[PDB]
Write a protein that binds this ligand. Structure first.
Ligand SMILES: CCOC(=O)N1CCN(C(=O)Nc2sc3nc4n(c(=O)c3c2C)CC[C@H](C)CC4)CC1
Ligand SMILES: N[C@@H](CCC(=O)N[C@@H](CS)C(=O)NCC(=O)O)C(=O)O
Ligand SMILES: N[C@@H](CCC(=O)N[C@@H](CS)C(=O)NCC(=O)O)C(=O)O
Ligand SMILES: [Mg+2]
Lengths: 198, 198
C-alpha cells in the first residue's frame, strides 16, 4: 500500500500509528504540518481533525480506528476475539483520560491549573486501576505485546512530562514501559523520531 | 452466550449495545442499577465505570469495545477492513463530541454555558461534516446498515433533546435516522424500551 500519515510535528495522537508502522517494518510518508498549513490542510479532512492516513488514495481518520485497522491480522492484535475486546477497552480507558486534558486551551494559567488537578486528583485512581489490572503479568493482554501496551507507553510518556512522579507507586507499570521501549523496532523509532515536547 | 449488561436506567452509553442485541435477536439481561446501588458495584469493577457486559461470567467494559466485539462477523460490521475502519472512525467522531459535554458537572452555570457553547458553535460543524460524509448514499458506510448508523441515530436522539433545530439544515441526516428507526427489530426495541431522558 501507499501510506501517507498527516499530523502536526508532535507525537500526540499520531504516535500510536507511527509505532505500529515501525514495529511492522512498513514504509510510509510521515507528513508533519506546521500551524500555518492548518487551514489549507483542514479544508480537506473529513471531520476537521488530524491525524488522517491516506491509503492508496482513500482517507482514513481517527487515530485509534486507524491503529486497529493497521493491526488486524498482525501479532499486535489480541490473540482471540475476547482479548481483542480487552485491547480495545484498555485503549479507550487510556484515551478517555487523555481527552480530559485541555490541550488547546489558550489561557495558560487556566490550562495549568486543570492539568495539575487532573494529574493530582484523578490520575492516581487510573494508575492504580491499571496496576491492579496488569498484576504480575508481562503484558496488559495475553502472552505477548499488543498495541495496548504501545498505547500505555505513549500516553504515560505524555503524562510524565507534566507529572514526573506519576509512577513512583507503580514500578510494574514502569517495567512495562521499559519493555515496550526495548523492543528493537520501537527503540529504533524512539531514538530517531523528531524530538518534540508532546 | 449468557449476556448481562449493567448500566444506569438510561440509554446513555449502553444504548448502542441494546440496539445491537435487538437487531441480532440476541437475548440478554438488561440490568439497570439505581444510583444508591452504584458505589458498592463500582468497587467490584476493574475500572470503576459502566456499562459493563458480562459474557458467560467474564466481565467486559468500554461501550464501543463491547459493541465492536458483538458486531464482528455480523452484517452490522463493515464489509472490508477499510470499511470497518470507516465504521470505527464515524463512531469515535460521534463519541468524541458526546464526551465533550459535561454530563456530570456539579457547577451548574459552568455546565450550562458549556452545553450552550458546544450546541451553538460545535454541533453545526459536525452536522455539516456528517451530511457531507453521507452525501446521497443510503447508509454512512457501504451498501447496508452498520452499527455506525445506529450510533448516529442514538447520539442524535440525545442531541435533539437539547437542540431541537439540530437537523433543520440536514434533511438527509433526518432520513437516515428514520431509516434506522424503521428497522423492525430496532423499531420494536424503541417502542418497548424504558422511557428516559438521556
Ligand atoms: C496519545 C495521547 O495523546 C497526546 O499525547 N496528545 C498530546 C498532544 N495533544 C495536543 O497537543 N492536542 C492538540 S495540539 C492543537 N493545536 C491546535 N488546535 C487544537 O485543537 C490542538 C489539539 C487538540 C486546533 C486549532 C488551531 C490550529 C490551534 C492549535 C493531543 C493529545
Ligand atoms: N479522537 C480523535 C481526536 C482528533 C483530534 O481532535 N485531533 C486534534 C489534534 S490532536 C485536532 O485536529 N484538533 C482540531 C480541532 O479541534 O479543531 C483522534 O484520536 O484522531
Ligand atoms: N468511554 C466509556 C465511558 C465510561 C464512563 O465514564 N461511564 C460513566 C457513566 S456514563 C460512569 O461509570 N460514571 C460513574 C463513575 O465514574 O463512578 C464507555 O463508553 O464505556
Ligand atoms: Mg474514544
Amino acid at each position: 500500500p501507499n501510506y501517507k500519515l498527516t499530523y502536526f510535528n508532535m507525537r500526540g495522537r499520531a504516535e500510536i500509528i507511527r509505532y505500529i508502522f515501525a514495529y511492522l517494518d512498513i514504509q510510509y510518508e510521515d507528513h508533519r504540518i506546521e500551524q500555518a498549513d492548518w487551514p489549507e490542510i483542514k479544508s480537506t479532512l473529513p471531520f476537521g481533525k488530524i491525524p488522517i492516513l491516506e491509503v492508496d488514495g482513500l482517507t482514513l481518520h481517527q487515530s485509534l480506528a486507524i491503529a486497529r485497522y493497521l493491526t488486524k491480522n498482525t501479532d499486535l492484535a489480541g490473540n482471540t476475539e475476547m482479548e481483542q475486546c480487552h485491547v480495545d477497552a484498555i485503549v479507550d480507558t487510556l484515551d478517555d483520560f487523555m481527552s480530559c486534558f485541555p490541550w488547546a486551551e489558550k489561557k495558560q494559567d487556566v490550562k495549568e491549573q486543570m492539568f495539575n488537578e487532573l494529574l493530582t486528583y484523578n490520575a492516581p485512581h487510573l494508575m492504580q486501576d491499571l496496576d491492579t489490572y496488569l498484576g504480575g503479568r508481562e503484558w496488559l493482554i495475553g502472552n505477548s505485546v499488543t498495541w495496548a501496551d504501545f498505547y500505555w507507553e505513549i500516553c504515560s510518556t505524555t503524562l510524565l512530562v507534566f507529572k514526573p512522579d506519576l509512577l513512583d507507586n507503580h514500578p510494574r507499570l514502569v517495567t512495562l514501559r521499559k519493555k515496550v521501549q526495548a523492543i528493537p523496532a520501537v527503540a529504533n523509532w524512539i531514538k530517531r523520531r523528531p524530538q518534540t515536547k508532546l
